[PDB]
Design a protein around this ligand. Structure first.
Ligand SMILES: Nc1ncnc2c1ncn2[C@@H]1O[C@H](CO)[C@@H](O)[C@H]1O
Lengths: 299, 13
């Protein structure tokens, strides 16, 4: 429980500059601190009683976990209070990731693909991100390219804890059909019709596989299908593999490790760190400097 | 129905 009343109005503190997007269909501007000039991403939402569920959970999540360098840091919040014939506007102030999303990088990139060393780097950052959250009994529940952001220096920061889940216990499971269809894991899709269907931290690791494929082929598997079909398909079809065989054997086995249907069979996060594709990385500086230059070209 | 939750019950199964 955190007090929303505590939050003052942001007029003379921060200033909006330009649009950047919406994860939960709530706007995001390039905020600027007035006195110092420092940049920060400000998610302007509209607060109600409908919303004071996601706002309670999400803020507590960021206060606890955002400190990690793999997660866009949470600077704080402000409530902009409007007249009676209007709605109150929450401001969430966040580490500005000036290179934008992975998905945008892919779209602005000739042939909508990335060099395998880039995929293996970003995947590691994400995996370190997830391992930090997973050890703290936190599921992201919506891992994909749109929620993986890049700084001007090309360090990888996760965003959007709107549909995240906190658990009291480590043995605990969830039963809420949630996330983005293409990136959703089968045991998550199961929670749509069958109320007995439960899942856990394993779901994120699948979404990472599908993100990994997203980075390779330029989009997730079944992207050419209506979401409601991909839904029917993902449990039925053989777990997705790479299209091109110009990728390495390790990368093929990584995707092959991530995307295991049975979440009993599917490895844990702690294991996925130990995989050749992850464990043995050319060098953190070597790929990042490289990937920095491509963002800096494709601005 | 294919989309879970969203901005305060916007298509919630
Ligand atoms: N810290 C941030 N920096 C930049 N853009 C952000 C940030 N947080 C959210 N966004 C925007 O919101 C989208 C999803 O939350 C991202 O793809 C991006 O456009």
């Amino acid at each position: 429980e955190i007090d929303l009343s505590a939050l003052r109005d942001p007029a003379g503190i921060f200033e909006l500059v330009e649009l950047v997007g919406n994860g939960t269909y709530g706007q995001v501007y390039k905020g600027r601190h007035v006195k110092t000039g420092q940049l920060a991403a400000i998610k302007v939402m509209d607060v109600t009683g409908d919303e004071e569920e996601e706002i309670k959970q999400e803020i507590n999540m960021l206060k606890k976990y955002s400190h990690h360098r793999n997660i866009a840091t949470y600077y704080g919040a402000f409530i902009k209070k409007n007249p009676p014939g209007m709605d109150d506007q929450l401001w969430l102030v966040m580490e500005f990731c000036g290179a934008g999303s992975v998905t945008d990088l892919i779209k602005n990139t000739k042939g909508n693909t990335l060099k395998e060393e880039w995929i293996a780097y970003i995947c590691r950052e994400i995996l370190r991100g997830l391992s930090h959250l997973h050890q703290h009994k936190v599921i992201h529940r919506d891992i994909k390219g749109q929620n993986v952001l890049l700084t001007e220096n090309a360090e990888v920061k996760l965003v959007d804890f709107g549909v995240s889940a906190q658990l009291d216990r480590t043995v605990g499971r969830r039963n809420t059909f949630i996330g983005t269809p293409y990136w959703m894991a089968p045991e998550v899709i199961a929670c749509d019709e069958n109320p007995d269907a439960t899942y856990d931290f394993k779901s994120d690791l699948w979404s990472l596989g599908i993100t990994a494929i997203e980075m390779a082929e330029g989009a997730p598997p079944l992207c050419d299908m209506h979401p409601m079909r991909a839904l029917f398909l993902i449990p039925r079809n053989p777990a997705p593999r790479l299209k091109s065989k110009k990728w390495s054997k390790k990368f093929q086995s990584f995707i092959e490790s991530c995307l295991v249907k049975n979440h009993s069979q599917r490895p844990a996060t702690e294991q996925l760190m130990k995989h050749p594709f992850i464990r043995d990385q050319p060098n953190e500086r070597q790929v990042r400097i490289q990937l920095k230059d491509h963002i800096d070209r494709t601005k | 129905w294919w989309x879970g939750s969203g901005x305060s019950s916007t298509x919630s199964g």
